[model samples]
Target: STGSATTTPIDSLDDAYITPVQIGTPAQTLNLDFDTGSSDLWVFSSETTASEVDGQTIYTPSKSTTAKLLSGATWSISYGDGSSSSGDVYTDTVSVGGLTVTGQAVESAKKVSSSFTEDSTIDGLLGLAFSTLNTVSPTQQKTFFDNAKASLDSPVFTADLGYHAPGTYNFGFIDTTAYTGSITYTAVSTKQGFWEWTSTGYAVGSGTFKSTSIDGIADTGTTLLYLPATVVSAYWAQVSGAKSSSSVGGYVFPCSATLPSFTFGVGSARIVIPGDYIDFGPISTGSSSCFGGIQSSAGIGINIFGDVALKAAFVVFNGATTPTLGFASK
Candidate 1:
C-alpha cells in the first residue's frame, strides 16, 4: 500500500513554481505553490471574501461531501515578502498526483494579501515544511506528507526545481535517474521547521573553498540565494563593475558581465551553481542593469538556499530519523 506522486513546475512571475493538487471528494484541482519554507496547507476557498477572490479559482467545500469544518480553529500567517493569508480549517480528501490522503486538514483562506490576489494563476500554498510549523489555532495541524507517511514506502520527497523551466517534485521515493553520482548526505536541524544545515565553506568560481561555517535553510518558496553581507561582497568583488545600489536594492552589475560559478559544501561534496544562474536576468527594462542572484540575508538569521541555488542541483529532503538532506549534481 505504498503511495507516490510526481508534480511538474509551472513558470510564473520570476521563478515561482506551481504544481497542480486535487482537493475535496469530487477532486477540485488547483495550482499550488509547494513551499518547503512553511508548514500550512492553505487554499483559496469559498470561505474567502468575494473581494479577495479575483480571477483565482476558489475551493468550494459545499461541493465535496467529505469536507468537514474544524470547529473554533483558525490560522493566520505572513511571509517575509509581506504576502499573507488567514482562515478557517476543513478536513477533506487531498491528493497530489496519484497519492491521496483522507481527512487531511485543509486551511481555507478567508483573506489573502494583494500579492496572492493579484496572481490568479496560483490558487494557494501546499506546505512541505515540518509539521511543527503548522499554524492551526489551539491545536496545530499536520501536513499532507506527515499524514501520508504511513502509506508511503519511504517517508521522503525530492525537489527538482529549474530556472524558468519545468521541474518535478517526487514524493515517497527517489528517482535514481534524476541525478548523477552519489548523493552527499548531511544531517539537518529541524528545530526551526526548515531543512537547515551548516555548510563547511564556499568559494567564488575556481577560488579557494574556505572553511568558514555558514548556517542556512533549503527553501523552495524563496526566489534568490541569500548569504552574509561579507560573503556577498566578496563574490561581487570578483565581478567587474558589480555594486550594491540602494535604488536597485541589491547587487547590480552590467547585463554584459561575465560572472563566475559558486561552490558550497556538504562534507567532501562540492555543489556548484553555474555563473549564468548568478546573473538573475535583467533588473530594468531596456537598461543594462541586472541583479545578482545572490544577496545578503542580514536580518533573516539564516542564509536561504532559494530556487536560484536549488535549481542547479538535485535535492532530497529526507524526513527519517534525524532529518537528513541529500544533494547531488543534476
Candidate 2:
C-alpha cells in the first residue's frame, strides 16, 4: 500500500508547510503541519475553548461514529518558544492522502497557546518522528507513519519540500522520478527520537569544502537552518552588510545585499542552497534589514537542518530496522 500528499507553504516566507488530513467518519478535513521534529498527532477540536478558536478548522469526535475515547490517555507538548497545547486522546479512523489508518491516536486539544490561537492557517500537527518522542502520559502513541508502516509496500516516507511552492510527501515507496542522479545514504541515530545524522562537511559559496562532521536533525517543523556559530559566522562574513543584531535576535543584513550560496555535503553529494533562498525576507514590513535563513545554533543545543536546507534537496526518512537517511538532488 502507498499514499501521497500535497503540502504547501502557508505564507510567502515559507515559514511552514501544511497538508490536508481527513479525520472521523464524515471526514472532517483540517490542514495540519506535517512536522518531522515531534511525535504527537494533535488537533484543535470541539473540546477546545471557544475563546481560543480562531478561523482554524476543528475536529469533532462526537460527529464520528468511528471515534472512540482513549480513556485515561492524555497528552501535552511544549515548544522552545513556550507555546504549548494539551488534551485528551481519542482513537479514530484517520486518513492522509489515500492511506487510511483505523484506530489512530488523535489528540483532541482542550487548550492551546496564544500563538497557536492566533495562527489560523494550521489546525494542528501530524508528527512523523519516532513514537518514543510521544508526549502521551501512561501510554505512548504511535505516529501516523509508524501505525501505517507495516502495511506499506516499503516502510519509508520521503519529503520533497519546495521554496514558495507546493511540494509532496510520499509514503510506502520512493518516487524515483522526483530526484536526479543517485541518492547518498547516511546512517541515522534515533536515540534522540529525531531523524538525526551527521553531514560530511560544508562550503561557503564557491569556496573549499570543509571536511568536518556537522551533526544535526532533519526537522521539517523548523523554519530556518541553524548551525554552529563558527559556520554561521563564516557564511555571514562573506556578506557585505551582514551582522549579528541583538535587537533583531539574529543575523540580519541589508535587504539589497548580494548574498552567497551555501553548500552542505552528504557523503560524496553536495547540496547547494541558492543565495536568494538565504536572503530570507525583511525583518519588518517595509524594513531595509533582511533576516538570514541560516543562523547560529549556539543556544539551540542541536543544529537544525530545517526547511531552509531541506528545500535544496530530496530527503528520505527510511524506516528500516536500522534506519538510514537518503539525500538526493531534486
Candidate 3:
C-alpha cells in the first residue's frame, strides 16, 4: 500500500539523483535515476553491447525465472541532451523500496549512447512521468507508479531532492512531517506527457517579485533551471563578472563571484533557491570560471524547473483522476 526510498546525488555537483531498484525473481539490484520528465523504465542489461558496458550494473533477465520476454515489443528514446537508448522489452517482478509490481515492463537496453556508457554511477533510468509518454512500440507500458496506484492508499508520490545530500521519495501516502506549512497545489498539463505547470512569477535576490506566468516542466532528469532569456539575463546581471559564453555553453562567471538567490512563485508560496545553488561549479577542472545552475531556455523551447529548483522544496505528484502538483517548503 505504501513505500519509501532514499535517493542520493550521484556527484558533488548534485548532477543527478539515483535510487536503488530491485528487478527479477532473485532481485538484481541496480541504482536507477528517477526521472519525472520521461516515461520508460529502461535499464542497462545483459542484452547491451559488451563494448558499451562500463562499471555499471547490468540486469540479466535470463537469470530471473520471473522474467518473461515481451515478444515483438521494443523501445527507443532520445533525450534533449542528445543522449539515446534503444532496447527490447521484458515483463518481470520489479521492486522499489518496499513497493513491488508483478509483470512490470522492464526495458533492457541493447544500445546506449556514449554518455550513458561513460556514466558509472547510474545503471539506468526509472521514468515517473505519465505512461502515455512510454516509448514502447505496438503496446505502451505503464510506469511502476501507474501499475501500483490502485493498490496504494493514495495515488500520489513525493520527491524531496537534496543538495549534495540524500533525500527521499515516498509513494502511496504523504508524509505530513516531510514538509512545513501548507502545500500549494497547481493543476498539471499531462498533454505534453510531462509534469508541466505554470509558475506565477520570479524574483532576483532582494528584488521585487515580477508577477508573470512562466510555463515550465518539473524535470528531475535535467540538472539545471532554465527560464526565459530575459529572466536569466536579469539574474546574471546582478553578478559582477557573469556573462554568456558560447565556448563553455550558457552563462559562466568568476568562481569567486557572489551569486544571488533566486525565488519562484507557486501560487502564493515563494520557494527560494539559495545563492550557492546557482553557482554550478567551475567550468573545467582548476578553472576560475564557474558555470551557472540557471540558464536561458530560449533554444530549449520551454522552461525547465530542474533539480536546481526542485531541491529547494518538496514536490508532490498527484496521480488522481485529474492530476495536480503540490509544492511545499521542506
Candidate 4:
C-alpha cells in the first residue's frame, strides 16, 4: 500500500528528524527516528530502570495484547557517536503513516547510554537499511520497509529532509514536485549495511574539483559531514583563521570567518553544500570558536554524508535487487 509521513526537524537538534509511528493493536503512538544508516526498530521500554529513563516515553510491550515476546531473543547496538543500547525482543503490529506491518520485531531497551537517556523525545529508531544489519539474536529482523515492499506499489522511498524545517518521507512513489531537474543515479555497495557510494572528487568554494575518489555512506542517523582526514584538512586550511583545535578535537574557525562551499561528486552529479552550512555553530555559548560541520572520518573507515550533507539534496533510498541512489536538487 502507498503511504507518506511528515518528519520535522528538532529545534537546535537538526541532527535528525522524528516521525510518529504506531505500535501494537490499539496503536501506542511514539516518535521514532527514521535511520538509514543501520537496521533494527528498537525503543525504550518498561524494562528500562526508572533512573535509566529521564523524560523519554517508554513502550510498555506487556500492555499490548498483540505484542509477543521473542523468547531468548536479544539485541545490542553501538553508534559512531558512542551512544548504545541493549534489550530483549518483541513482535507487534507496527504502522507508519497509514501503512501497517504485522509481526514486526521491536526491540525493547533494558539499558541505554547517557546520550539516549538524556535525549527524551526520540523514543526509538525506525531502521530503513537492509535487514542483514539487524542486531536481534537467533533470527535477524526485517525492517518495516522490507516487510512492506512486496505490498507496495514500488520498492522505493523518497527522503525529503529540509534543513531546519519540516520534510516528508513518501513510500511506494516518488514526488517529482519535491525536487528539480532529473535525478542523477549512482551505484552503491550494500555489503557494509549502508548506502555506500563513491565520489570522483570534490572542491572548495568555486575552486577546481579534485579527481581523487572518496567513499562514503548517506546516513540519515548521523548529524555531521564526515570526510577523509586529508580532505577535511584541505578544506579547512583554505579558510582563514580555521584551525584544528585540540580542545574541540576538530577543525574550529572564528564565528565571523567566511566559510567556503563544499561539493561532492556522485558519478557526474555535483552536490554542493552551501557556505553557511559549514559553520555548525559555536562550540559553546559566548565562545568565539565554532566547530565546523565538516569533520575528519579517517579512523571511522567509512566517510558519512550525514544530515549536514543530505539535507542539501533530495535522496532516494532505492531498495532494489541492486540498490542505487538517486539524488536531485531540493
Order the candidates by lDDT, highest first: 3, 2, 4, 1
Residue 267, model 1: lDDT of: 80
Index of the highest-lDDT prediction: 3
Cα lDDT tens digits, model 1, 140-188, are 9999888987788888888888765677887788889999998998889
lDDT of 2: 0.94
Residue pairs with backbone overlap in model 1: none
Model 3 is weakest, by summed lDDT over 10 consecutive residues, at 275-284
Q: Model 4: per-residue lDDT, tens digit, 183-234?
A: 8988899888888888778998899999888889988888889999999998
Candidate 2's C-alpha runs over 4 A off are none
Clashes of 4: 0
User: TM-score for each prediction?
Assistant: 0.95, 0.99, 0.99, 0.97
Tell me how many clashing residue pairs each candidate has.
0, 0, 0, 0
Per-residue error (Å), model 1, residue 247 = 2.6
**Which regions in candidate 1 have their CA more than 4 angstroms from the true location?**
1-14
For model 4, the superposed segments whose C-alpha errors exceed 4 Å read none
- Estimate candidate 3's alpha-carbon lDDT, on a 0 to 1 scale: 0.95
* Candidate 2, position 169, lDDT: 93
Model 2 lDDT per residue over 1-330, tens place: 898999999999898999999999999999999999999999999999999999999999999999999999999999755789999999999898899999999999999999999999999999998999999988999999999999999999999999889999999999999999989999999999999999999999999999999999999998899999999999999999899999999999999998899999899889999988787788999999999999999998999999999988999999999999999998
Better of 1 and 2 by lDDT: 2
Q: Could you tell me how far off, in angstroms, the CA of residue 176 lies in candidate 1 after the best superposition? A: 0.7
Least accurate 10 contiguous residues by lDDT in model 2: 74-83
Alpha-carbon shift of residue 51 in model 1 (angstroms): 2.5
